[model samples]
Target: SFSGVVDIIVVRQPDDSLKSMPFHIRFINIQITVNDKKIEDVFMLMLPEGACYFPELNAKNEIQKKLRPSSAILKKFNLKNGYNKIQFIAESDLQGKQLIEGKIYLYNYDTKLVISDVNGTVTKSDSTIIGKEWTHDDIAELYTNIQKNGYKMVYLSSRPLYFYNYTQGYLKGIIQNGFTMPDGPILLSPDQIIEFKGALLKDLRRVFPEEVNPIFAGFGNRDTDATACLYAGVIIDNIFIINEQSQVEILGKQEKSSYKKINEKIQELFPRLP
Candidate 1:
């Protein structure tokens, strides 16, 4: 049997690729084809709801929302073991309403996945908390560092989906005030930190065959992050925990003493950025 297939949806018609905005997408029409065979079926334009003013989520207040899917979309495009093509027509006001076309692709993966936490692992969280601009050059280097090593990066954040625009904006440079943002998909979770991350990692592993596309390494600072990575079955030695204040548990097994050491090691292992 085939190991597995990775499904990726891209919004190309209107040229909107999941921008950071507090707006809902209304799907006008959807078309699908499997191996040149067109399947006639329309899908519900289901999108997440977002809060405008306060984007960040506090555990104490506000429930996180999920990017729910349309059953019709899944029902029509029963994925085979090969290439699948999906087209979308949607309308949105975020970028000023226009004819939108969504594109979808299926990636047959027989490779590696690099899963990491966003807040403390790759970016400094303290500055964000205090509403100050903070970007770590070392951590930024590490991002380009991994992509050079033939691994795909996926970011999981405890931040709620309400902040999708805020997070994406920040990643896309809004929070940085025009500075370039990191390139990668940042996923928000609906559950608490530990369970949410563990689930997200598990889902990624599920897309590929068991042990076929296992994570190369997992990075994070807090105890929840460690728990989630471990729960997802990351290799003991490959899981690198960064030193930070909020982390309550020490793995006692694998840990990096300092960010500089980790940065140096990353640079040594991976080739220079393109």
Candidate 2:
């Protein structure tokens, strides 16, 4: 539900006709669910310069078809029935289990230059133009591990949407740039994710947004590149940065524990949100 991260709806039927009608046909009284809460908020949509909204549903669909797939849009659907169609499932634990959010950083690396031509032709070493080192394979392994552990991921990239062709293209570009193999259902950041709650606009290009499923994480390394994901309330990565060889201490205080260091960082930077 991009354009914004969450949605809600409400309905108030006339007491007199409640029993007579199988459903309310007066129109314009429904809501969407957000974060397991009902939020009857105003929906925001982006239309082209000449685009206009038609009072009728058919005409409205016509206008929507012309807009870019990634453009922001809001729509309404009747859900008189129970919540069975939606696909996203962030299950609740009795209390303490982790919420399971994953995030990863994208980096361009070497090994891209090492692959020989089909004819096995050799080429000059241009580490400057290309990458000089490769850890993307390691990155993939970490992503796989996260998936194997049953943790969901929300990949965030710093790249702009305009550069890549589509979701898969974006991922291919990232892997090529990083010198790793590729993976499926590639995600590209389309909006700015703010504070890991909700976005300011509707970003429906994602396969998960409609039903609010696993987000399509993309590639990039800038705050702007991650803005869309940030707005998507993605606080974790399928892959992450961890190196053990370097001798280090966590703030050199109070026994230098992991929880203290990590929680301390979160408190300092993002203490305002839950």
Candidate 3:
């Protein structure tokens, strides 16, 4: 029997221009690993319509090719505007039935998003390994507060896609360790950190447009991160950099040296979305 896991996906599609607007097709990125390795052959994925076969590829290159049969274009009308629970079976003659289940978050164009970096931003240390990582004090509470204030969280990690399962487990582990991370889609870059981060943000800006300011705030711990957010249209004032000492340095704004202080004044810092 082959056991597999699917990554949680978050999708943001373009808004309808008008009643007669063309259906904006979106791709639901589906990644499956059977028996601890990428499947080498096509697998039958049963969606709402029926079963369809999509090719698989190595994580290094052509990762997007795995996004076939699951493409929103085929089920555009079937998907609503929010969280859709998609349960499917990955079947192959050799692997038999590998149950695939997860939620594909379909965010609205005007949704307020809080983009955050993982490693040094939330983790107590910038440890390269997974289990060794820990989160800073009150980090989870701060994010929980942000979610309560009506902002959607998007964790943008420089960690490569190969670490997807371990990374997911790490996040869950931290939550059990009392670091209450808000629920959201976690996106892992395929190397080339800055380029990938910038492109993803740019695409988000393009689909969301400027007036809405879809990107509400950004949090990171590196200069390159600040650069990526700046290049992607996030204002300097909304960019936050956390240091080794747990101090938060908000670009173009006052500095708060601790997550505790930020949480105390959370209302003043991140006012509730109107």
Candidate 4:
């Protein structure tokens, strides 16, 4: 009624595995043989946090279960003993644990499928932002305390160095309205932002770009900025997939609030840096 099989796949062609796919992947397919009897098998698929799975919906099962086929990726690959092979594509959710699983059935032959991708990690968030404004005085205070304790400050952002002027103006405006910029943080430009930011990315890369690339690259306008960030010795972001959730209702209010908070946080960390 059932047999087990293992299959290994060779890519055949070499690829710039990193740039060719923004998100990591694991492609899988199961093969099954059919005879006279009908039997079922249970299968499970597990993924890391940075991806979301979307399963095939229209496909029907001789046996249906309570768990709906997950949208993040096709979890359950089934064969009613008619097909020779079955495939499940794994894209990325690019957020949290994207683990999923499903079941299948085989009549005679042992079948095997190959999954060729695994993007992101099992860890939680790497960074976060606090709500509300931060005062420059707060940053100044942190500076003294941190230095005395033999600690250093760091300011990481997705900002363009070319807009350094614009940023300065805006920061003042933010402070006048009341906020902060502390630690006088340096920028981490994205390889993308470097295209627009120009010379800065390259110059920084020559010294220590690990300290400079992310801030420049995080924004979406990649054609212009990304190239520059790359020159700055910054790597491109590794994404499995991204599903953003936004509330347009407070679009304007949120923008203003976000700016103020960013400035305040800056002041609270780097009171002296321009």
TM-score of each: 0.57, 0.28, 0.71, 0.22
List, residue by residue over 22-48, the lDDT tens digit for candidate 4.
111132222222232222343323334
Q: Report, for every candidate in turn, its global Cα lDDT versus the true structure.
A: 0.47, 0.24, 0.61, 0.26
Candidate 1 weakest lDDT stretch, 10 residues:
12-21
lDDT of model 3 at residue 17? Answer: 30
Counted clashes in each candidate structure: 2, 31, 1, 61
Q: How do all the candidates rank in terms of TM-score, highest first?
A: 3, 1, 2, 4
* Candidate 2 lDDT tens digits, 11-130: 112221111100101101223333343333422222332121212235446433221111112212223321112111122233321121111111111100000010001011110223
- Number of the candidate with higher TM-score, 2 or 3: 3
Model 4: how far residue 10 lies from native, Å: 48
Q: Model 1 residue 11 lDDT?
A: 18
How much lDDT does candidate 2 score?
A: 0.24
Give the number of the best model, judged by TM-score.
3
Write model 1 residue lDDT over 111-193, tens digit each, in one string.
45566676666465521333333554455555555766655566666764344445544554523323333455555554621
How does model 1 fare in lDDT? Answer: 0.47
Ranked by TM-score, the better of candidates 1 and 4 is: 1
Candidate 4: regions farther than 4 A off: 1-167, 175-196, 209-222, 238-274
Q: Kindly give the stretch of ten consecutive residues in candidate 2 with the minimal lDDT sum.
A: 111-120
